[PDB]
């Protein structure tokens, strides 16, 4: 279990943000690319090419 | 739109080439063989990487017979890719009552190749598939019944050690693994030396299984 | 008896036949999978069918009150109730022969049956139905008795009506009937001996198919037999014969209408596979 | 000895993954308004399988998919049009998965025969032609993407993934680590790492250059038979036989939210995200496609269209489309 205890050891000494950082930088980026999205605001079927 | 017109036009070909296909697909027998401890890599692809896919030809029909032997990984994760096969071809070794897995020593080889018929058989992708069961090594078994009384695996063996009905004992054991006897079939054979005897079973076999999903798709039922 | 026992009895048929034929028809249209060769089949019987449903109502009114509705549409009506009785029992015939061909013949007969299915079908049932027809559309006109406006196939003698009650007899009965009866027999002997759940259940459904064509369409030909063979001199009893052999056909008559609404549940409803896709299609 | 190790260092992951949860995505979310009720109609039904189909891949110009199917026929469809443009037979009619090149040039296939084949669609006959068969899983082949026009990666049911150069045919990087089948695989906007999700009921996050493990993610009770990024590669959702939806965010290296419902007992079979990764698509077992949001859990919408278990399912790069495929031999555009 050499590799798998060295392994462990390598995942172990990373650099782990907040969780609530990372839900804010998830939430900026679902809201900075919402207009860009066909599916939440449908496109006007003129420019739809389905 | 004479790119679309050509577009549609190689769309329709390829479409009735597409249906063709299919026609002769429809037009075919699959069937998955199975087994416990051999594998099932016995006589049954003798007669005539990771699945081995053997064509044969019987009274003008196509067969297609499918080995997952190589498939060591977990069967639930693929095992729904068969649900449609015509049917199921298991294969038992008689003479493997009193032998044991190499893997666990307090494990019956046949006791095992009883789950994994069980285990089959009331799947639930193979609810309509018929299995015609294959008993190998019938001769072998004979001579071994003599030496050594079949109760290894069946304790409950209250029989004579007689090939005859020691062979009926343990068909009526595999056939007694089926939950659902109504909807499906099992169809037993004693494979023997001559090979044209082994795959005349399975025409009839297959021949059966063909005519019930065509009543069942006629209508008549 | 008469006015009010037909109208009552052409409208319970008339209830069952456009909902069973056309529940039958909305499963088939609403239908993602492809279609089999029974599939079509079911299709070709329920059109059919339909049509002779539709027919129905113009019968039952005038048996209220005799034909007012015109010369054209009594020919429309005549001419459509052909076509729906001549293709229903042909259908029922092509339908058997396809079961026979995949009970007996199931490995080797695939493509017999779609040649078969598509192009005999037409050739062999459609065609034919309005080739019959066409004396309908000659012979059918309006004519008064009495103070009363009746119509039907009127003919120039009685040879006519001899002649074509015998074709009747001979395109509805007898063609159907044989193929019906020599196709569903050999179906049942291959499956009397297997104790199958499934061959059981099969062998019960022929035989109710066999039992529900023949006492349909029996008494109905019996007695238009009956009525030929009095018209032509052979058979001579007193007027009261004829007047029972002829409120015999008029009972049996309906009695064969029901086979507008008794063929949706043979053919579509009974079966497990149409079940399934009658619920797929529901949701 | 080695065990007592690796037990502690577990421990401390976990006390160092809990010392981070700070505040749930849950109860920072409550403040942004839900997601209307999302209703797509279906706009194409591309016929033409007949047996069930097992994968799509949309296009990178997001109007040519292909979808693979185990009659043994891997199709390439126009969307916009419906038209078939190719239909490429296959040597095994067992295909798990098929792949769409970026560049659009080839198409990858494989499944039961352990087997990725690489079809050239652009040749100058005119016909499509097996470009490279690639061997070496041991055990079936269920997901593979490419990285470019020259590099594939696959994984299989040996409970590896591997790195391949379709040039040589050969396996430039193999990754180990997964206890059980791995079964999905999703790429990196970016390409240079991939997340896999195993039969293990654990996903992990590997490095395509280097060739390790870069972090390991658990918390799904069954087995995991989808994953896939989110559109900026800092997150990634899981679809598992639980009848749960997770996602788990790289940076702070352990799950935010659980998207599941108690009317919902069947697992999932693909997952996939909007452009804006606000919804999270979802193919379950009980024949139909639940759309999520990402960002609060809830429940917008549903597209259930398909007469069988919805196997496949894929989002365009523009956006404009999600493709479900099923069991039931039927492909559908949704928008
Ligand atoms: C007006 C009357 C006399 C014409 C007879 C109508 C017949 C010939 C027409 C009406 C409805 C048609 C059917 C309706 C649709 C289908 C689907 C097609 O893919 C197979 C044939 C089938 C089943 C058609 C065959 C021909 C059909 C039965």
Redesign the interface.
């Known amino acids: 279990?050499?590799k798998?205890?060295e392994?462990?050891?390598?995942?172990?000494n990373?650099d782990?943000?907040?969780?609530?950082?990372?839900?804010?930088?998830?939430?900026a980026?679902?809201?900075?690319?919402?207009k860009?999205?066909?599916?939440?605001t449908?496109?006007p079927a003129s420019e739809?090419?389905? | 739109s004479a790119e679309?017109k050509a577009?549609?036009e190689?769309?329709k070909m390829?479409?009735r080439?597409?249906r063709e296909?299919?026609e002769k697909?429809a037009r075919e027998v699959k069937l998955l063989l199975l087994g416990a401890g051999e594998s099932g890599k016995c006589t049954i692809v003798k007669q005539m990487?990771?699945?081995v896919?053997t064509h044969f030809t019987f009274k003008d029909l196509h067969f297609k017979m499918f080995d997952?032997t190589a498939?060591?990984?977990?069967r639930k994760?693929?095992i729904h890719?068969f649900e449609?096969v015509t049917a199921i071809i298991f294969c038992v070794a008689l003479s493997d009552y009193d032998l044991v897995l190499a893997e666990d020593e307090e494990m019956n080889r046949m006791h095992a190749s009883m789950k994994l018929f069980d285990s089959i058989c009331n799947n639930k992708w193979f609810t309509d598939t018929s299995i015609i069961l294959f008993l190998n090594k019938k001769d072998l078994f004979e001579e071994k019944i003599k030496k050594s009384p079949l109760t290894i695996c069946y304790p409950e063996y209250a029989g004579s050690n007689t090939y005859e009905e020691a062979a009926a004992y343990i068909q009526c054991q595999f056939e007694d693994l089926n939950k659902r006897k109504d909807t499906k079939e099992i169809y037993t054979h004693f494979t023997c030396s001559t090979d044209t005897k082994n795959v005349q079973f399975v025409f009839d076999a297959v021949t059966d299984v063909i005519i019930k999903n065509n009543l069942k798709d006629c209508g008549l039922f | 008896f008469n006015k009010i026992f037909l109208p009552t009895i052409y409208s319970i048929i008339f209830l069952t036949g456009i909902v069973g034929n056309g529940l039958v028809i909305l499963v088939m249209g609403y239908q993602?999978?492809?279609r089999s060769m029974t599939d079509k089949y079911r299709l070709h019987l329920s059109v059919a069918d339909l049509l002779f449903v539709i027919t129905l109502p113009f019968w039952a009114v005038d048996a209220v009150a005799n034909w007012y509705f015109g010369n054209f549409l009594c020919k429309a009506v005549h001419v459509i109730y052909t076509v729906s009785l001549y293709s229903s029992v042909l259908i029922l015939a092509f339908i058997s022969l396809d079961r026979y061909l995949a009970i007996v013949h199931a490995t080797n007969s695939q493509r017999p049956r779609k040649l078969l299915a598509e192009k005999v079908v037409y050739v062999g049932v459609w065609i034919p139905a309005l080739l019959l027809t066409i004396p309908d559309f000659i012979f059918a006109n309006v004519s008064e008795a009495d103070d009363r406006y009746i119509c039907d196939r009127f003919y120039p003698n009685d040879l006519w009506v001899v002649v074509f009650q015998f074709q009747h007899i001979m395109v509805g009965l007898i063609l159907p009937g044989i193929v019906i009866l020599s196709c569903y027999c050999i179906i049942i002997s291959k499956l009397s001996h297997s104790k199958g759940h499934q061959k059981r259940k099969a062998l019960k459904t022929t035989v109710i198919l066999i039992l529900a064509f023949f006492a349909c369409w029996l008494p109905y030909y019996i007695g238009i037999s009956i009525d030929s063979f009095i018209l032509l001199e052979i058979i001579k009893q007193g007027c009261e014969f004829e007047n029972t052999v002829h409120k015999w056909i008029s009972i049996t008559e309906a009695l064969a209408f029901f086979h507008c609404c008794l063929n949706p549940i043979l053919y579509a409803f009974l079966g497990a596979k149409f079940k399934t896709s009658a619920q797929?299609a529901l949701t | 000895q080695?065990?007592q190790?690796?037990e502690q260092?577990?421990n401390?992951?976990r006390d160092?993954?809990k010392?981070?949860?700070?505040?749930?995505?849950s109860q920072?979310?409550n403040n942004?308004d839900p997601?209307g009720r999302?209703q797509?109609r279906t706009?194409?039904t591309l016929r033409?399988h007949?047996?069930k189909i097992?994968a799509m891949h949309w296009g990178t110009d997001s109007?040519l998919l292909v979808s693979a199917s185990?009659?043994?026929?891997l199709?390439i469809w126009?969307?916009?049009?419906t038209?078939?443009?190719?239909?490429i037979?296959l040597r095994?009619s067992?295909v798990?998965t098929c792949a769409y090149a970026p560049s659009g040039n080839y198409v990858a296939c494989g499944?039961?025969?352990?087997?990725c084949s690489i079809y050239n669609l652009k040749t100058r006959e005119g016909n499509v032609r097996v470009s490279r068969e690639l061997?070496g899983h041991?055990?079936?082949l269920?997901c593979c993407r490419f990285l470019d026009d020259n590099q594939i990666v696959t994984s299989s049911?040996?409970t590896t993934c591997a790195l391949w150069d379709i040039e040589t045919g050969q396996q430039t990087t193999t990754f180990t680590?997964h206890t059980?089948?791995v079964?999905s695989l999703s790429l990196a906007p970016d390409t240079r790492l991939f997340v896999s999700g195993a039969?293990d009921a654990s996903a992990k996050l590997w490095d395509v250059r280097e060739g390790?493990?870069?972090?390991?993610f658990t918390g799904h009770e069954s087995?995991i038979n989808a994953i896939c990024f989110?559109?900026?590669g800092?997150?990634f959702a899981t679809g598992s036989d639980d009848a749960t939806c997770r996602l788990f965010?790289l940076?702070?290296?352990?799950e935010?939210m659980t998207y599941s419902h108690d009317n919902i007992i069947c697992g999932i079979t693909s997952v996939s995200f909007?452009?804006?990764?606000?919804?999270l698509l979802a193919g379950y077992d009980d024949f139909n496609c639940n759309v999520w949001d990402?960002?609060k859990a809830d429940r917008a919408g549903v597209l259930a269209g398909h007469?069988n278990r919805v196997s496949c399912l894929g989002?365009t790069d523009?956006?404009?489309?999600?493709a479900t495929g099923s069991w039931?031999?039927?492909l559908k555009?949704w928008?």
């Open positions: 279990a050499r798998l205890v392994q462990l050891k390598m995942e172990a990373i782990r943000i907040k969780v609530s950082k990372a839900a804010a930088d998830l939430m980026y679902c809201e900075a690319h919402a860009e999205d066909p599916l939440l449908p496109v739809n090419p389905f | 679309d577009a549609v190689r769309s390829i479409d080439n597409l296909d299919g697909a990487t990771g699945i896919e997952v498939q060591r990984s977990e994760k693929w890719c449609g | 993602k999978k492809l797929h | 080695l065990r190790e690796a260092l577990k401390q992951i160092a993954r010392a981070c949860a700070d505040a749930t995505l920072i979310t942004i997601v999302i797509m706009r194409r033409g007949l047996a097992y109007r185990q009659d043994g026929k199709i126009d969307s916009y049009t038209n078939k443009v190719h239909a037979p095994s067992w798990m499944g039961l025969d352990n087997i061997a041991t055990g079936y269920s049911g040996d680590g059980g089948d079964m039969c390790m493990c870069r972090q390991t087995d989110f559109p900026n800092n997150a965010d940076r702070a290296d352990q935010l909007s452009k804006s990764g606000r919804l990402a960002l007469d989002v523009d956006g404009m489309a999600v039931d031999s039927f555009i928008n």
